[PDB]
Design a protein around this ligand. Structure first.
Ligand SMILES: CN(c1nccc(-c2cnn3ncccc23)n1)C1CC1
Length: 340
């Protein structure tokens, strides 16, 4: 017996279809799950609308992660009452049968689900552009000084459609997030989307989320992760294949430089004992001059050489090794990849 019969051996609440809570919510069905717990579709009888209830595991580490999340969501939502900046809306929260419960607006499929639905062949450049514009607008809002929030776990699965037939999105899952100058974490970001400064053990700021965004946008159009490392050494080597050896001024100050690199007599750095550095060109991953990914966009509208050159230019600015010169949200939104 766990939690008087209400919980399973994984710390999760055992969902019961049609259960009534608090003279208010009628639980319908499970609609998603993850490390944190479960998400159910429920009818809110007071507000007369469907909601998504995120039921956190009954275990102190998961409870405290979600308490951090609640505080950040309350801060963000207070500064976007019109819901124009692409962050999910937390309506309220409560404790129920020893589980913290977060009540959200209901959302639809995530962007990994969309990739699966393309048979892992990618969405169009036009749809990629729509997702990119909304994500850059969200990053601009997170960078406002009263927020200064670093999401720290951006990936396709954490970006959700509002409605199944439309391109509008919201970002979810602030459990691993932090604020500039209240930064605590040395180990952060899911591996495929992890920035060079984090891999190298260096100081970090909101620019880590822009790195993740550049990786995400390439994957949305090709269908496959850009840098699919199996461990940190493989991750760094995959980044180097595309982007070359990082600048010496960075490696000279990196606590973990020698996990990946060695310094030569002339002061230059090379890899420790892959395609040679910088020879896996993004120009060819995207298929700029050869019909897009797999050549499959040849003959389609919305996929010109000129369009692809603008996309490539913006991505390479998001993937700058130097976090001080990497493109920032304000300037990303002004880039000619985006439309008047
Ligand atoms: C339709 N769904 C949904 N709808 C609204 C809000 C959220 C949500 C809010 N915060 N988080 N955090 C992690 C994972 C999901 C969510 N999920 C997803 C299936 C679960």
């Amino acid at each position: 017996v766990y939690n008087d019969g209400y919980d399973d051996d994984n710390y999760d609440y055992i969902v019961k279809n049609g259960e009534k809570w608090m003279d208010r919510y009628e639980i319908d069905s499970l609609i998603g799950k993850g490390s944190f717990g479960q998400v159910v579709k429920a009818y809110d009888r007071v507000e007369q609308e469907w909601v998504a209830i995120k039921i956190i595991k009954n275990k102190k580490a998961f409870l405290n992660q979600a308490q951090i999340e609640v505080r950040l969501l309350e801060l963000m939502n207070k500064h976007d009452t019109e819901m124009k900046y692409y962050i999910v809306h937390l309506k309220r929260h409560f404790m129920f049968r020893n589980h913290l419960c977060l009540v959200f607006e209901m959302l639809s499929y995530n962007l990994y689900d969309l990739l699966r639905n393309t048979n892992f062949r990618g969405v169009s450049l036009n749809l990629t552009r729509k997702f990119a514009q909304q994500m850059c607008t969200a990053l601009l809002f997170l960078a406002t000084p009263e927020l200064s929030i670093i999401h720290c776990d951006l990936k396709p699965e954490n970006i959700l459609l509002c409605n199944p037939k439309r391109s509008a999105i919201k970002i979810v899952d602030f459990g691993s997030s932090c604020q500039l100058g209240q930064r605590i974490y040395q180990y952060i970001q899911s591996r495929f989307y992890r920035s060079p400064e984090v891999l190298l053990g260096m100081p970090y700021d909101l620019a880590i989320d822009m790195w993740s965004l550049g990786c995400i946008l390439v994957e949305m159009h090709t269908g496959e992760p850009l840098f699919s490392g199996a461990n940190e050494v493989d991750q760094m080597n995959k980044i180097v294949e595309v982007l070359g050896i990082p600048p010496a001024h960075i490696l000279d100050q990196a606590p973990k430089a020698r996990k990946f690199f060695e310094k030569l007599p002339d002061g230059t750095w090379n890899l420790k004992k892959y395609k040679p550095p910088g020879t896996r060109k993004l120009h060819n991953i995207l298929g700029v001059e050869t019909g897009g990914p797999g050549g499959r966009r040849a003959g389609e509208s919305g996929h010109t050489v000129a369009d692809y050159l603008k996309f490539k230019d913006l991505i390479l600015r998001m993937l700058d090794y130097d976090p001080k010169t990497r493109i920032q949200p304000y300037y990303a939104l002004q880039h000619s990849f985006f439309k008047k």
